[PDB]
Amino acid sequence: TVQQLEGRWRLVDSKGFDEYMKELGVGIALRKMGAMAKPDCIITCDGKNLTIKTESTLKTTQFSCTLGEKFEETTADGRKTQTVCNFTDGALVQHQEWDGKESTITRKLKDGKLVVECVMNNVTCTRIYEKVE
């Protein structure tokens, strides 16, 4: 089930991500950092607490997301979000709530790559991450 999404997952593609970091609320130096750093997303499960480490070549953030429940996330930029995390047989939706504003992060398995299709409301990013094993 969720162990199809586990491992070190290394960033290659990020189409839509300039427009999505603009619509989130990300400053221009943080937008340059997030695009140039090239993140490795490391997923590993205890049961409901799913450990997600973002290793980028510039900044870093690590969190255990409670699967079928909300938690307080702190973003790599600075914003803090009330985040409900749900796996629907293939797709992990991380639903990020702050100040009446949602960001929806759909991490799903396509051809042995973790394809992260995010949407704020209208504005999207499609990020392709490859398995390091």
Side-chain angles (χ1 to χ4, degrees):
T1 49
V2 76
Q3 189 150 112
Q4 289 90 272
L5 309 188
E6 285 184 81
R8 178 173 274 105
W9 297 105
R10 180 253 183 183
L11 190 69
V12 286
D13 197 336
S14 291
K15 62 216 161 197
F17 195 55
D18 198 89
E19 302 173 274
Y20 175 74
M21 295 188 288
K22 176 275 190 184
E23 224 76 283
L24 277 176
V26 185
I28 56 151
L30 296 170
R31 304 212 306 99
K32 190 176 184 286
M33 184 202 83
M36 84 185 273
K38 201 97 291 187
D40 275 63
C41 182
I42 307 94
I43 299 168
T44 303
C45 188
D46 290 305
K48 292 169 62 71
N49 69 288
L50 183 71
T51 307
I52 305 180
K53 191 186 186 194
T54 298
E55 287 178 336
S56 92
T57 63
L58 252 159
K59 205 167 193 284
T60 295
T61 302
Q62 187 179 283
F63 63 88
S64 70
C65 61
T66 310
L67 194 74
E69 237 289 60
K70 76 145 69 172
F71 76 104
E72 193 190 56
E73 180 255 18
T74 301
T75 62
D77 302 310
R79 302 174 305 292
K80 295 185 77 215
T81 74
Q82 289 270 288
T83 294
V84 65
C85 294
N86 290 301
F87 179 74
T88 182
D89 203 55
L92 172 63
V93 180
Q94 184 177 324
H95 188 273
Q96 302 258 93
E97 299 292 69
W98 79 97
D99 299 289
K101 302 155 199 292
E102 75 178 286
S103 180
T104 70
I105 324 301
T106 306
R107 305 193 181 82
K108 79 202 203 203
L109 227 292
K110 277 160 60 168
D111 190 59
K113 275 66 74 191
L114 184 80
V115 175
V116 178
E117 288 163 39
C118 88
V119 67
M120 179 65 185
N121 53 67
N122 188 262
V123 179
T124 62
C125 84
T126 301
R127 297 205 304 279
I128 292 45
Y129 293 85
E130 71 190 333
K131 209 178 192 214
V132 179
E133 62 180 23

